[PDB]
Write a protein that binds this ligand. Structure first.
Ligand SMILES: Nc1ncnc2[nH]cnc12
Ligand SMILES: [Mg+2]
Length: 330
């Protein structure tokens, strides 16, 4: 059997980011169980822990290894050099090697839809945003969310609190409570766990799930969620290893390609659901790209001209906010 390994930055118990990775591992086992065997390690920190943990999985005989967090980028590039018969698949990074692929999702496409919904739902026009770490993926998401909201309410605001890691349920909960205490009427996040959405549900504040459909933790208050569909990708790459056709590739895919999808649209009026559907549909067809001008930056300078679509290279290094965001970027 092909031994396939997984490194997670959190626990499957997060019921968000790591959980979606592990549910996709389970999809792999269900589709190719007779020919594949999976192993994982969880709560693996960036840096030395990641290097040792990736090396250990390779030394145990795993011939395809998925490193499922951005901070594993450099550790995966380093370790891959020492294991030429192993194939490595790094999540959300932009670095590849002869035996290392990079798989990224346009999560910001889902953020745009959520922003549209948020601007229709929030009576105050204010959302609480729980940031993880200020890497370009997160800045993209904040910016896209705001642009979506601003296509309904030009005056929409977000209040951002940084947790400073991907998974930290204590700080995620604290951030949600602080944002709700400060008067926001929508909660959203780029951290990994269900901590904030349960706080929001406990306070009757409507929210978006992250990575996974988190409806079970907020049945009457989740509006939708940006859902990461890793399973078909994991199956395809395992098949490619099994049949000997696996080759290094760098990909960045979104709704059109099926890597990102919205959860069902719940707890909102029918016209808001119709508009969410229409928005997702326009992104999925290629008609709507959230980062299409006119768009100005936080400091007032123009970014994109009327009708001008962003280059992906700009997004991948994104380190500025669009006009309307109040946060100072770390
Ligand atoms: N949303 C996320 N959670 C954890 N690790 C990540 N790496 C990239 N995006 C991530
Ligand atoms: Mg497009």
């Amino acid at each position: 059997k092909l031994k396939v390994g997984f490194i997670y930055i959190g626990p499957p118990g997060d019921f968000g980011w790591t959980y979606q990775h592990d549910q996709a591992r389970k999809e792999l086992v269900e589709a190719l169980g007779d020919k594949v065997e999976t192993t994982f390690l969880e709560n693996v920190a960036e840096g030395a822990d990641a290097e040792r943990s990736i090396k250990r999985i390779a030394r145990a005989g795993n011939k395809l290894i998925f490193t499922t967090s951005f901070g594993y980028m450099d550790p995966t590039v380093k370790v891959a050099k020492k294991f030429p018969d192993v194939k490595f698949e790094h999540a959300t990074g932009y670095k590849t090697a002869d035996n290392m692929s990079a798989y990224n999702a346009r999560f910001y496409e889902g953020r745009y839809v959520q922003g549209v919904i948020a601007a229709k739902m929030s009576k105050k026009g204010i959302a609480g945003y729980i940031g993880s770490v200020p890497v370009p993926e997160v800045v993209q998401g904040i910016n896209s969310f705001m642009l979506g909201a601003q296509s309904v309410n030009p005056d929409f605001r977000v209040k951002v609190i940084w947790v400073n890691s991907w998974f930290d349920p204590g700080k995620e909960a604290d951030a949600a409570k602080a944002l709700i205490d400060q008067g926001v009427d929508i909660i959203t996040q780029h951290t990994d766990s269900t901590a904030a959405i349960q706080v929001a549900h406990d306070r009757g504040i409507k929210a978006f799930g992250q990575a996974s459909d988190m409806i079970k933790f907020a049945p009457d208050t989740q509006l939708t969620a940006v859902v990461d569909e890793w399973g078909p990708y994991y199956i395809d790459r395992a098949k490619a290893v099994l049949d000997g056709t696996w080759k290094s590739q760098n990909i960045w895919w979104g709704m059109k390609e099926g890597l990102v999808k919205m959860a069902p649209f719940t707890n909102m009026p029918d016209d808001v659901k119709k508009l969410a559907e229409e928005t997702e549909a326009r992104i999925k067809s290629g008609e709507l790209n959230p980062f299409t001008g006119p768009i100005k930056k936080q400091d007032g300078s123009e970014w994109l001209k009327a009708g001008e679509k962003a280059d992906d290279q700009t997004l991948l290094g994104m380190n500025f906010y669009v006009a309307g965001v109040d946060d100072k970027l770390p």
